[PDB]
Write a protein that binds this ligand. Structure first.
Ligand SMILES: O[C@@H]1[C@@H](O)[C@H](O[C@@H]2CO[C@@H](O)[C@H](O)[C@H]2O)OC[C@H]1O
Ligand SMILES: [Cl-]
Ligand SMILES: [Cl-]
Ligand SMILES: [Cl-]
Ligand SMILES: [Cl-]
Ligand SMILES: [Cl-]
Ligand SMILES: [Cl-]
Length: 433
């Protein structure tokens, strides 16, 4: 019987949201399941009433590669040659899904990440590996600005966040482009910042998304007086690393987005894998104090690993939902863009981890409690600085998927709940009536 204290007036970072991606034709793989299952998958991902309520959507800016195939491969680029633009909305197979989920679910944060500049800008003449030619830095700055401008003016899509390079540390067997940190500062200071200023770009920059979770690729730009003007967000993946503070990023008042993580080595779809990712979010919120957290694919055609939250079998036209969709939903469905983390006893007892969030504009709040141990844990929650009448529990476990429970009466700013082993429960409430 342990105690968690939640303080309404001790506040931390603003939460920008939670995201997924459908890059590399996975958006088209959803549609191939048929209209009925397509809408079911949109619902599971983005609905705030019967889904995970993801609030950010990450997509690939087409590079024109020729690798892969139609099930997993690149999209045509809107600038296939230095002297040719091709604003054909059919080039980007993510546009139909973006329009549908912005309309139906109000998803209004749209991140486009570049995996590679087009081949004619690359040192090896290919979108696979290599680097950006130094005599193509301006062409790439123009490339990025023209995409933000013309996705709006031609396709009606507002790109609110632009990711300038996915994993600049890595050359892969698919779309990739290697940068050094100093090459990124030179690109920001001498090309991106003056081009974005000249074109009056208001989209925020998610800085080069390091494969490992550190700010090393951003330190050079963050300390540059010109580049720092548009280092709006420092992005990073969490493949093979752990959650640490981004010291220089916080000193410059910038945001932190963990824009991709998944299990590429195993295929665990049970609550144990789900609680692994819930614990990653908890560490992200409390160690790094980050602002947005992303899984990799929302739905994908890989039934053999954990790169997506939903595994689609294209041959039988079926899909299977892993527990990680719901364990991540325990955060993402309730913590909307603009919410604010508040103080809660982060570790009340062994294997129990707690965070808390509030909406400063409605008085709504959410308390997310993880129990990734083997023992039932009775917890008494003391609410400091606010007094709701009741809380509503939502639980995910080996037998429950974001299951709404009976309301729990709050007696003098205190309520108790027994956390089941290997489970996660969110308590949701409102202070204004
Ligand atoms: O099927 C392939 C995917 O597995 C691959 O996913 C990559 C996983 O590592 C991440 O760091 C990368 O950002 C992500 O692209 O993408 C290519 C696709 O063909
Ligand atoms: Cl591109
Ligand atoms: Cl890369
Ligand atoms: Cl899972
Ligand atoms: Cl992602
Ligand atoms: Cl899996
Ligand atoms: Cl809200």
């Amino acid at each position: 019987a342990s105690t968690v204290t939640v303080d309404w007036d001790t506040t931390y970072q603003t939460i920008d949201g939670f995201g997924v991606s459908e890059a590399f034709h996975q958006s088209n793989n959803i549609a191939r399941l048929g209209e009925t299952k397509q809408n079911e998958i949109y619902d599971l991902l983005f609905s705030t009433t019967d889904g995970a309520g993801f609030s950010i959507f990450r997509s690939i800016l087409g590079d024109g590669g020729t690798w892969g195939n139609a099930d997993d491969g690149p999209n045509k680029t809107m600038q296939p040659a230095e002297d040719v633009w091709d604003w054909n909305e059919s080039n980007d197979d993510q546009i139909p899904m973006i329009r549908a989920i912005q309309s139906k679910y109000g998803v209004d944060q749209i991140l486009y990440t570049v995996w590679s500049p087009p081949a004619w800008m690359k040192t090896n003449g290919s979108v696979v590996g290599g680097s950006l030619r130094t005599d193509k830095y301006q062409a790439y700055a123009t490339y990025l600005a023209e995409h933000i401008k013309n996705y709006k003016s031609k396709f009606g899509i507002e790109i609110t966040h632009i990711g300038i390079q996915n994993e600049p540390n890595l050359e892969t067997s698919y779309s990739s482009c290697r940068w050094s940190p100093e090459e990124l500062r030179i690109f920001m200071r001498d090309y991106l910042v003056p081009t974005f200023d000249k074109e009056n770009i208001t989209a925020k920059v998610v800085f080069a998304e390091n494969m490992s979770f550190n700010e090393q690729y951003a330190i050079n730009s963050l300390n540059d007086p010109i580049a720092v003007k548009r280092v709006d967000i420092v992005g990073a993946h969490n493949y093979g690393s752990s959650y640490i503070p981004f010291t220089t990023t916080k000193s410059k008042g910038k945001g932190i987005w963990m824009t991709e993580v998944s299990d590429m080595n195993g295929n665990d779809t049970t609550i144990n894998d789900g609680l692994r990712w819930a614990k990653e979010i908890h560490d992200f919120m409390t160690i790094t104090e980050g602002n947005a957290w992303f899984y990799w694919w929302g739905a994908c055609f890989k039934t053999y690993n954990g790169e997506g939250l939903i595994q689609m079998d294209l041959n039988s036209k079926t899909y299977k939902v892993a527990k990680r969709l719901y364990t991540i939903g325990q955060f993402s469905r309730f913590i909307r863009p603009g919410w604010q983390r508040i103080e809660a006893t982060k570790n009340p007892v062994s294997n129990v981890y707690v965070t808390a969030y509030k909406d400063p504009k409605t008085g709504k709040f959410a308390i997310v409690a993880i129990n990734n141990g083997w023992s039932k844990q009775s917890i008494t929650y003391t609410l400091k600085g606010f007094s709701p009448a009741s809380v509503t529990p939502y639980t995910t476990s080996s037998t429950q998927n974001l299951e709404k429970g009976s309301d729990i009466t709050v007696n003098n700013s205190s309520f108790s709940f027994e956390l089941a082993p290997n489970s996660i429960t969110t308590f949701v409430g409102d202070t204004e009536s």
